[PDB]
Design a protein around this ligand. Sequence first.
Ligand SMILES: *[C@@H]1O[C@H](CO)[C@@H](O)[C@H](O)[C@H]1NC(C)=O
Ligand SMILES: O=C(O)c1cnccn1
Length: 515
Amino acid sequence: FSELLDLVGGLGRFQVLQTMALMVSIMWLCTQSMLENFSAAVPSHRCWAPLLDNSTAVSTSLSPEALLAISIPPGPNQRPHQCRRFRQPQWQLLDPNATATSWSEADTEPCVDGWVYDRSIFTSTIVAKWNLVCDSHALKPMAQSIYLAGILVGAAACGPASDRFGRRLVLTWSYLQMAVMGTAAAFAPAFPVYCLFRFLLAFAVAGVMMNTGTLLMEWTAARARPLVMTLNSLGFSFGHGLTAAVAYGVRDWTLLQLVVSVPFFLCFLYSWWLPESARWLIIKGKPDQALQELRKVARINGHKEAKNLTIEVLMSSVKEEVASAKEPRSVLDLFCVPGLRFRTCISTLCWFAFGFTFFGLALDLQALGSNIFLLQMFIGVVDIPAKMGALLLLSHLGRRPTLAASLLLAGLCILANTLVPHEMGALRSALAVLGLGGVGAAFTCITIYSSELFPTVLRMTAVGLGQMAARGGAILGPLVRLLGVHGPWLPLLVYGTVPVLSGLAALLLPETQSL
Ligand SMILES: *[C@@H]1O[C@H](CO)[C@@H](O)[C@H](O)[C@H]1NC(C)=O
Ligand SMILES: O=C(O)c1cnccn1
């Protein structure tokens, strides 16, 4: 194919404008995923109680702390209980000479009159809107899991649709569906409906992710291909900073979700000016249309020499791409061939570990430190040098030790985050950020390494199995957070163990750098 790109301009003005226009969309797409650090933040809460919250009642000489001690019992964290209140005011508990033995569990009841939430950091969140607290606490990670399951299902459906209807067309309607479903999620009347619209938004997020990369590849000359994939990966890095920036100003979840959805109407509009992939058009037997796309790009780049092109030139020079129909393959082939079974297991486990760990940790920054805006910013700022350093080390040291050391760095940081005492918020934040940076670097490594462990006809199938394994592990990510009932050490121990085990396994792969 490359001769046509070289005749049309393989890295010209068009490819520059296209890379910029697609990176910007990836930034906003990243905000959509990271949003529920803020859209679903848990403000501190207690039961509603007459002496505290009945604004029409007669006043008293008591201070707020006195009334609070009189009305809500203490919880383990030296703070008011989040799910109980006293059945009758405990006037006897006001004196400092009182004892915890002065009252019994029968003197307490759950929040019959509902909850009261701290509005000082966020004006509203879904947790406050639908009372996803106490007995209902599981519903937040369930919502996150449903979104990530949407990404898995959407990626499964994207393949057939992208091959049958075209790269740009599926990208276009994915942008529109993201806009519409995000806007609808911002105004959902009930929690089940919010879950449904987040699922249908994720279904489109998968399409944007897949077709952005594909449509960059099929218009980029091979000399520039690694760089363009790297820029695609930096899109998410800047997306984290953008999430912090937008969420710092917009403290209301409805307006926040709306603000991050509205851009995709603009993405939808300008996706009509992109050209459809010329490889796909010729492979599907439409060289007369592919000729128009090629001359369109040439017009943008300025290559008047495109006057040389004809459908005969295209059909003569792209037959080698058309010939790919000869050799089908399937996922089971990876496991049948005796030499490829072991590589497949270890590679898939590494993809899984990326997805599981990242979407386990990066969606509860409120547990990792005291300021989630700075945490959300720093997991971008540190992620940039992590990705770039991965590309350096993966060239100097080979694939195997870079992948292994990246995953081991991640796992040992996340595990150390169980031992550092909760008083030391700064050090805990630092270890969390570095642990996430290691996982990003591991993503870079395993993306490249999985493209080399396999023979050329099974390369695509192996990378596909890997990507679906990562998407599948992300589903289990949030659900492991429910183990926090036994103390926050346990979710962190699990999220820390998985990358250590997969990193150790990665040492058993064969090295693939040219030696
Ligand atoms: C609130 O206080 C007023 C005071 O007159 C009282 O009539 C009303 O029943 C109280 N309501 C609750 C829910 O405490
Ligand atoms: O996708 C990203 O930009 C990323 C990945 N791992 C850690 C932090 N950021």
